[PDB]
Symmetry: D3
Subunit: 323 residues, 6 copies
Amino acid sequence: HHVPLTFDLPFEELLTYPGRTPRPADHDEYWDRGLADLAAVPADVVIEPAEFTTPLARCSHLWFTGTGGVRVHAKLLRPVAPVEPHPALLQFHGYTGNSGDWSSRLHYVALGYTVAALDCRGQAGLSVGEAPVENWSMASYLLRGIDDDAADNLALRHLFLDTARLAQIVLAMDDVDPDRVAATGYSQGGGLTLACAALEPRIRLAAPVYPFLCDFRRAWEMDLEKGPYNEITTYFRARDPRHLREEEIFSRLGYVDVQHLAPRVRAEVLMTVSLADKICPPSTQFAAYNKLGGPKDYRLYPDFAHETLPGTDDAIFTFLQGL
Amino acid sequence: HVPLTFDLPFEELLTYPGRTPRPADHDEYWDRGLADLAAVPADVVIEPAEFTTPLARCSHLWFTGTGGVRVHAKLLRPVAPVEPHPALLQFHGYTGNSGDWSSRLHYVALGYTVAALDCRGQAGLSVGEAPVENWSMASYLLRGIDDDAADNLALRHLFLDTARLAQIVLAMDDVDPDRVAATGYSQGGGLTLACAALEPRIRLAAPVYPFLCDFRRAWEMDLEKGPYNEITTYFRARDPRHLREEEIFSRLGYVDVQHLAPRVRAEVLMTVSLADKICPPSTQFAAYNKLGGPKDYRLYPDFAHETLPGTDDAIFTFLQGL
Amino acid sequence: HVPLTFDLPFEELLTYPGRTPRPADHDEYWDRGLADLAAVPADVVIEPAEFTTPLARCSHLWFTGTGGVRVHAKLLRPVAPVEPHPALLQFHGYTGNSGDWSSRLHYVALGYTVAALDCRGQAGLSVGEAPVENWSMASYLLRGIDDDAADNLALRHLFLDTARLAQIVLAMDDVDPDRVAATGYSQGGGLTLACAALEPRIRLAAPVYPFLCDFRRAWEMDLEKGPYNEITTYFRARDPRHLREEEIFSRLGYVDVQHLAPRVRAEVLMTVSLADKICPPSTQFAAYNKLGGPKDYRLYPDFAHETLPGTDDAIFTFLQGL
Amino acid sequence: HVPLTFDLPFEELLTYPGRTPRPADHDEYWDRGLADLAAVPADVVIEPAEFTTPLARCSHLWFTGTGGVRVHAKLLRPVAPVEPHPALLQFHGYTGNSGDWSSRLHYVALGYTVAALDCRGQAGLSVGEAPVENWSMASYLLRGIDDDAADNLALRHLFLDTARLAQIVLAMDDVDPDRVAATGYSQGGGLTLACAALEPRIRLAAPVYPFLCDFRRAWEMDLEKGPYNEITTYFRARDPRHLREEEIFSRLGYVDVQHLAPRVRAEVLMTVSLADKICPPSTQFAAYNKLGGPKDYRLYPDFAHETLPGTDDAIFTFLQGL
Amino acid sequence: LTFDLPFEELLTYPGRTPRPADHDEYWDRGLADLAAVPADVVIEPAEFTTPLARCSHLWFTGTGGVRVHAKLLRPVAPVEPHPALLQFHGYTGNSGDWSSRLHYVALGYTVAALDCRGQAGLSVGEAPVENWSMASYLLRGIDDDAADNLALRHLFLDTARLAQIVLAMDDVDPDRVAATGYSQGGGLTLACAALEPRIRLAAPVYPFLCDFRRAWEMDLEKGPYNEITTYFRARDPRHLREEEIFSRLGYVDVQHLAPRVRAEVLMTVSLADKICPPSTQFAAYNKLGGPKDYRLYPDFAHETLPGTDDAIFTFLQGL
Amino acid sequence: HVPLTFDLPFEELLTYPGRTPRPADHDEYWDRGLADLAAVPADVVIEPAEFTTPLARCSHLWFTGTGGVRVHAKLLRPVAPVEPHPALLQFHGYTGNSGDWSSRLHYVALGYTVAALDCRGQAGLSVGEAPVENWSMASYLLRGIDDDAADNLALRHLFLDTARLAQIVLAMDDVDPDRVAATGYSQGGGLTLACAALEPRIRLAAPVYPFLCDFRRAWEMDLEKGPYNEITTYFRARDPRHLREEEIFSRLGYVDVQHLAPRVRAEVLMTVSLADKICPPSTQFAAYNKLGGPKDYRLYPDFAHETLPGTDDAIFTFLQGL
Ligand code: NA
Ligand code: NA
Ligand code: NA
Ligand code: NA
Ligand code: NA
Ligand code: NA
């Protein structure tokens, strides 16, 4: 006995943890309608030249139309003179960040991969198009659209469908073997990795690192000092201080909880978790991990928080070499 | 010998000129804004509120602002109005809302009409969002700063909302248009001055540590906490090398309250706390020193961005002269 | 399975019995206190105040409490009442004062008398100090704890001050003794319940996150900040090995609001914020669960010891039933 | 180039004159204080302590101070003195007490008598409180500041307690009155200087980062923590607009150790740590620079309000020359 | 809320690392390695002077061939053999001021105060290791081939050597010697009384260097036990060697030396202490091999505990 | 005006001369250092690594440095080179290691050899320690500072390790000795400059907020956090009164990167963040202003000691001109 008091759950409990955010009864119909809504919007793919140049790759700006009639951007890097269809890698970035430096993924192009890195709407990248909502609250981007009449105007639903469209576009490229596409990302990018592999089940491998956007109600109940999950509390303090609508708010967040999309995943998943992480508590991550629909494995860093995890990029690189 | 301060010594506050650039066409921008507002029909709708009391008729006041959105304000009026009487406009703090109905019933008991605006997208009922060409989630204060022209700034729409509220209230048949005042704390203090500037008929104005003044001075001071950090948050997202620093701060000059201050004709009573690190006193005096009407200030040397004992009585006594 | 929390899970709050022991002679202690108070002539003096408004007669109310000290309260009365009318007693926060005259004028406009006590030695006009045998600067709350008998506790005098103020207001010719209410925040919330217990004729009581409850529970939680840390400060100074732990907390039981709550006959509306680490919800419900009259509560799950939006309207609506 | 410091650069410390006024009747105030003290019979009572050791006779010493209050000091005497010998007076830190008997037995082994005062109301055995006309719980340091005359200041009673202890110890038959020293840390350092000023016969004085100097300088500084913040607490409670700022700091000049420093004739060895934000070096040098006897200082550049390695040996070597 | 264990469970708490199976053999080899190193004791005058004592620098050779320093204070004119007191200082500090122990010399005692290797005193000799990591002094040597190069072992053997030297002094009654210290000095007090069990009394205050695995598991924000986490983050981020690291640390855990202690122990502990959690201290207290009592300060942390110096002084007068 | 800063205003950064003394025999010290290194046979051993990829040949590079210790570096070479090609030396942050193999494979795909040193005793495979006469656990940076001569400084061994690593890579058969670069962050930035100074054949250098510059300036500043506080930690342990301050800082001048900067002939691209309180900009420009070759800088005004978006692309483009 004599187990100390952790802010989160003991590891033995994590592997059986079922989550604590309600799954709406019409979850499957919600996402089929979302995928149908997306398919009814013509992608209108335009590929435009980039300023960054190197003999290692062809660098481009990839533009497409997402739900809400918004133009969305992704960095696109393709190998010079490909001869046979080859793998591709989709990368997703952290909350409020952007797709990052071109040169950080040139080694994947050197392996022969196409790499596409999405810029999330309104964050630090080139996606600057905003879909409207009926009820605008400045309190929270994560909860944008939560007060609309129907649940289809959630900002995170547009974001998830953006990842689905990017995967659809990349898979359809003639140079890309549709059976050899992977996804990876940190934090928000980890959650988007799983949402992408769920809405495009053709994805073969997925490597999220401490994924964000899981188990919203568990995150709220833990009363975390810092981090983006505090947007939930900020919204409540602004628009429902007595929590009269608590059940309706969390039932709608259940539509965009990655843990309830996880059963659709067919990719093999390699998930990295650090146990001192108070930004993405391990319990919220394993809520999604435990519901994954394909083969899966995890890597633990007991003494680390939401930071660089030494050796993980090599582990992911070796994992993605099997594509 | 002068002692060290995080801000400026009080001696230099009274002559401080501000450090945020004034665009050469400031006047044309705001004249164009008021003309744009006047070209949108107000479409005023007044509906009863659930809160009831024998002290006041409480209503929801709805109108259309710039950008094609509906805006809400609380409206409190005497039950059986007789002669035309004074009115008071109130503006709330950043991310808050117009607050409790009962906190202003004593002004109605004096015979005043009270109107309290809900700022767009904040904690109240104004939930309509004007679109922008370039959306950044980094900052509401800088929303619209990357559009082609400076007419899509979110702060511009907000200022014109206060102008419309003043116009509607002054036009009410039971309101003497020469006996209208405005007051507010923090963001509400900055909106009080913007309102008294864009509707110069306002007779008295009582801002408390006003926000939204001297943006560039605020950015240069390195403030650990507070809403002025939204400027740094934006630069970190969309211009980390400050290649567009001059253009961003020039555009912000359009919505810097200090440059609207010369239009104010109301008598102003401004309350300032000297240990305030959310709205540093220097940013407040940048606007105060440019005021176009009579003015006086009240200081709280040992207080920060908090409740200031005696200020509500000072404002009430000040507003009794309406 | 319930999630971790710094306090108790909400489902355990409504059955929580407290931890500070109830003294066996609690009744005799408080009957003796009321007898001690009655044996001191109140010596009521009412003088006009500087603050003036057509909405109310404003006055300074002075009386003598236990220990022979003079105590002050703000007094606001309707300008021309005919029949007996309601009254409202207000109590302020720890180390604060009765506050601004104008923040209570809407109650006078309803026809109420309003009386707002200034606590001894705090930020108001009550500056008289009752002596003690053993003085420790470590804690105001524990002042008098080391005297021979328990009748010199500084909190006892304070509670009897609220009782005397209620007695004076009920005895006023134009105050209906059946239509008196009490309300207050934090320290004022605990004083509201102490007042309604020692003057059970009070009809309504509206405390907000009440202080001065369940002293032992507060000490055992070891909070980072707040006035409950005065208990720890006293122990570190005058009993570092806790040789007198039981005598100290049994003494505090006399001035624990939770053990006066069974005397309350007023209907109580209690507001609680669940992230409050100044007054933990468990200590508040120790008193709530022992209340002797009708009762209801209002929760703010994500708020701490701060402004609670809607609470002033909720209290105003509650107090309109006077 | 002088790098930026929170306090003053060291070159300016040696000429720093202080920033707290100095009353024109300072000398008359303190001559009256000593005469008031002499008019109260000491009524010295000495009883054995439970702590026992063959190295010393350990006793409790009780006397009456100004205000009709009983004051305690620890008294340690050599077992076989035989001949008149030196004595050492020790004063303790703010809110503490005189500390362990065994921490000063090496001075008794030298042949010295040791007396260690317990400050009124702090963690020791001095629990008697002198009354004031106007009680504010905000600050012990400013207790008495609002009375009619300035003779009820709590710090004045404390300073006169150190003088009485010195007078009692010097009059002992086995104490050579010209071989008496004083020493202490923080509050005890300020009391060391006040004692050597009010009993100028004291030969050596060893303060360590002394407290209770240059109150106005401390207030003007951005002190995040420490007992000097009691001044701000008082202003926030009883004078938030600083209308009485000049009166308050003029009265504090009576109990500022820096203005007692010219009376000191003892040789002083002062220890200062330069990163100290509790007692800023500038406030200490305000007193040091005005000292009336020979003096030297010891600097610890990288230390704050903490243990200073080597200082107790330095003081011991200094006090062996008694 | 309950940061540590409730007091009700402290007196039965067994610690979080099992006694190594060859613990006795490890320390018999350590003491034998020490005995094979000549002490080469040198005593030199110190600058601090007082009529109350002779003050000296005491130098000797410890394991690893380094020179180790202790302050030595002796009565000026002793007649018969008399008691002695050994003192140990806090982590990264030094033996402190000469004058803080003159009252023990005035009782007639010899006082010896060790300076720990590499800390703030005069012991500046460093024993080499095969694998050097800058992350942690406490775990220095943990990655060498055998466990005999642990820096903490050298430190423990220094206290044993100092005690052996002091007991062997002609004017010291070897059966009237005590040890005391705060924090690291409290743990060294216990190690000293274990490796030289002739020590009669021991008075540790919130002892350090106990129950390492429990300390790491508690995720303390702050303080010297965080060196364990710092080492793991540097040299084993996935904890592949977790079991070998902690069971190597069991050799230098003071709790497993506690059964050798025969001195009467007076342990002072403060209950709000987050630097040395009470549970880790009672892991050692519960295994002590001699008479024992404790003193509690419920509202205090890792700070001065009023009355403790008088309690220890009264306790040590029975020497 | 008055733009207060924790560091120096940017106008003065470009002229700042440093504050740490340069020893008069600086040139002789480092020529002796290079000669001592040359007298130790490098005994280079290259072993295959376990990380594998078709993009590169990955190996462990081992050599002997000063003090008779074995040092490790990660070595990545392009598979089957047909002509001499460029090489890149990378240095890591304080207490870190050379990092993941795959983070530099894109340079190998360009045709470069990459060598990444592991600093002695840090998180990598270099675990050999050179002995010192006087060991203090207070500071690795100041290790060896108390020895009789200055040739035992730990920083000197570290700097000579970079020289040997550069010498080994420059001497490789398939490496063009005229096309070698160095780059690194923080400690790796200082090592980048030390390397290009002790091996002046280095062609390009790209440090990011370099560490190990202007030790005295670093100590003189506030700086609550960061590795520069090891200086204060050492002083608090081994020189609390600063009696040896001039000796300590004179010795640090031998290993202060600013005084090796005049030897640099590489073109330097230095990246600086202006809110960096770990490596203050003034300390970095002390070295930059003394650089002996072509140079340019990149600024991030709102960033601290963190990831600087765009910097890896900027360095990559810079290194493509190799
Ligand atoms: Na394809
Ligand atoms: Na009108
Ligand atoms: Na009545
Ligand atoms: Na005498
Ligand atoms: Na012996
Ligand atoms: Na070559």
